[PDB]
Amino acid sequence: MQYKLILNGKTLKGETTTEAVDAATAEKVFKQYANDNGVDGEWTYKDATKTFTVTE
């Protein structure tokens, strides 16, 4: 499924997607994508719109 990630912060902001087979994999990959770009923050997940949010 296409999961989404929303980024709120100053180091990084905007939206990005990933095709992952479930929400555990999608979570390892988005958190990898955040560490790549310097992002440290708090995470929510919303199984109803398959969407992750991280806010710095």
Swiss-Prot record:
Subcellular localization, as worded in the UniProt entry: Secreted, Cell wall
Sequence repeat start-end pairs: 2-56
Domain of life assignment: Bacteria
Name of the protein described by the UniProt record: Immunoglobulin G-binding protein G
Organism: Streptococcus sp. group G
Upper lineage: Bacteria, Bacillati, Bacillota, Bacilli, Lactobacillales
This protein's encoding gene: spg
Section covered of the full-length record: 303 to 357 of 593
